Amino acid sequence: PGEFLQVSIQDTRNAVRACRIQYHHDPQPVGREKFTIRPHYGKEIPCTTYQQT
Amino acid sequence: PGEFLQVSIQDTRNAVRACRIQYHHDPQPVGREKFTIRPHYGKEIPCTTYQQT
Amino acid sequence: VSQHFNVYKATRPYIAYCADCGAGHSCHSPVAIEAVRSEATDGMLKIQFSAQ
């Protein structure tokens, strides 16, 4: 989570070209608890994602 | 301070192998002041540590 | 010296299950974390994992 977003690449001259925008991005997970890392023991709840296909 | 802990190493094929767990870790110092970095002029107070022997 | 690391000749690293291997997916990791001890009032913490 952070108040901006920035992406960059490396050009042929080895310089750095970046753009920075203002984006909010305070994400929370599905269900009734605000956890950070998935556990080894838990329950399976439906959620949606962007498939890489 | 932060809400998780992660460790990682390079394998022989030079990929990154990592493990990430949920860990709270909000540490505060000794005394009656919540400072961040030791000053050049202060007082001494007993504290414990993990010795490197 | 001689027997200072005689203890570690009889033990090997292992593989255990890590439920988040950096990308949000589970795996069988060679660096799985077992416990974190935070007893030093200094602010220092001690991690135990699977490799050596």
Transcribe C1-52 into DSSP letters: --STTSSTTS-----EEES--SSS--EEETT-EEEEE---TTS--EEEES--
Phi, psi dihedrals of residue C47, rounded to the nearest 5°: -105, 135
Chain A residue with minimal CA distance to B20?
A37
DSSP state of A16: E
Cα separation, A38 vs A19, in Å, equals 32
Cα separation, C38 vs B27, in Å, equals 9
Taking the CB of residue C33, how many other CB atoms lie within 10 A of it? 19
How was this entry determined? cryo-EM
Q: Are C28 and C44 in contact (CB under 8 A)?
A: no
Tell me which residue of C32, C39, C41, C38 sits closest to C14, measured CA to CA: C32
Q: Are A17 and A6 in contact (CB under 8 A)?
A: no
Taking the CB of residue B19, how many other CB atoms lie within 10 A of it? 26
CA distances (Å), origin B49, targets A51, B36, B41, C19, C46:
47, 17, 22, 30, 11
Cα separation, A19 vs C46, in Å, equals 39
For residue A29 the two structure tokens come to 């997970």
Chain A neighbors (3+ CB pairs < 8 Å): B, C
For residue C28 the two structure tokens come to 């069988």
The CA-based angle A31-A28-A51, given to 5 degrees, is 90
Cα separation, B7 vs B4, in Å, equals 11
Please indicate whether, in this complex, the C-beta atoms of C30 and B23 are within 8 angstroms of each other. no
Cα separation, B27 vs C45, in Å, equals 10
Cα separation, A39 vs A29, in Å, equals 13
> Resolution to 1 decimal, in Å?
3.0
**Is A19 strand, coil or helix?**
strand
